[PDB]
Ligand binder design. Structure first.
Ligand SMILES: O=c1[nH]cnc2sc3c(c12)CCCC3
Length: 254
């Protein structure tokens, strides 16, 4: 082909992700290599078009190769200093972009199911892009909502209902994991291993022990939002349109 695999960008799972550069136009893109879920990832990618979602260029199979937008900014994960987090103004901006990305996905009945800082990429202007749809699934089709039942995700970003219920709504699960992401951004640590009662840290949160880490590192305005997102009852949990009206979310930041 006309593309040279310059270097490995990401690794693990089905295949490593590599940076390809066109030796003619010289445009750079990302190439995901998978050797035989992948069918659904491609299908889903075809539906997506948003400036806060990693662009899908197209695909070819020599082992399937997917051409994705290249984010030179790397992953959000690497903008979080451990135990510190990041300046609140950057966190808010990143959160606003994450919300737009998610509103969009949910708007077309798609749930990501694995929202975490490793999957939130940054472009050259530090714009955030939702990445990897290999675990994404349809939760609304023909205006009909389907509850989920398969357990997906990453334990620290996972919502509690997903551990204790046979079926659950998709949207609040993505909302929960965005809250865990906000926590990571403002405190540089994850609150718990998983959201179960067997887990001391989660039990402490439910009891409102905000004088513990990581909550003590978080200003009271964002923390009030986190109080509304990390609500155990997925029916009580704040929804995105209501997040959009939250005081911290609308607070101008230096
Ligand atoms: O730039 C990308 N574009 C599309 N997918 C991916 S995955 C990955 C990146 C990337 C770059 C940082 C290392 C991890």
């Amino acid at each position: 082909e006309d593309w040279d695999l310059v270097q490995t960008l990401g690794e693990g799972a089905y295949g490593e992700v590599q940076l390809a550069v066109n030796r003619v136009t010289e445009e750079a893109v990302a190439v995901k290599i998978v050797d035989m879920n992948i069918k659904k990832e491609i299908c889903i990618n075809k539906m997506l078009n948003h400036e806060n979602v990693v662009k899908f260029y197209g695909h070819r199979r020599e082992i399937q190769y997917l051409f994705l937008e290249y984010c030179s900014g790397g992953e959000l994960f690497d903008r979080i200093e451990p135990d510190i987090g990041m300046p609140e103004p950057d966190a808010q901006r990143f959160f606003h972009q994450l919300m737009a990305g998610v509103v969009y996905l949910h708007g077309i009945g798609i749930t990501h199911r694995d929202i975490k800082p490793e999957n939130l990429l940054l472009d050259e202007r530090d714009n955030l892009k939702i990445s990897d749809f290999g675990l994404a699934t349809v939760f609304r089709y023909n205006n009909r909502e389907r509850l989920l039942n398969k357990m997906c995700g990453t334990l620290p970003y996972v919502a509690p209902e997903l551990l204790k219920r046979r079926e659950f709504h998709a949207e609040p699960v993505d909302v929960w994991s965005c809250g865990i992401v906000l926590t990571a951004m403002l405190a540089g640590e994850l609150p718990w291993d998983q959201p179960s009662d067997s887990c001391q840290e989660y039990s402490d949160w439910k009891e409102k022990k905000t004088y513990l880490n990581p909550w003590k590192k978080i200003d009271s305005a964002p923390l009030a939002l986190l109080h509304k997102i990390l609500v155990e009852n997925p029916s009580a949990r704040i929804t995105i349109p209501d997040i959009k009206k939250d005081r911290w979310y609308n607070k101008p930041l230096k």
